[PDB]
Curated annotation (Swiss-Prot), chains A, B:
It comes from Homo sapiens. Belongs to the connexin family. Delta-type subfamily. One gap junction consists of a cluster of closely packed pairs of transmembrane channels, the connexons, through which materials of low MW diffuse from one cell to a neighboring cell. Residues 1-21 are extracellular. This is Gap junction delta-2 protein.
Amino acid sequence: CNTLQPGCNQACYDRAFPISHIRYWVFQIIMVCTPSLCFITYSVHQSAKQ
Amino acid sequence: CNTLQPGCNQACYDRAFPISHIRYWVFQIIMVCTPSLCFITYSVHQSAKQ
């Protein structure tokens, strides 16, 4: 970045990219799989009961 | 100056101080003394004539 003041780079980088795209994608992928995991656990519990 | 672009310093210095005060003062002092010099030369010529 065209600047000489110390700390003018980190603040600008945070402003431009508060949350990176990879974190959002990972969060979405992990959140989407939770109903499948809970269904698998419920099926395991049902099998254990019988 | 708070900048990183090369050449951003000389142009700004020229814009802020196109002509320095010392040059103007010297020019004024030299210009003021010219009538005295021409009067002295005219007096010398008059003395030489007589």
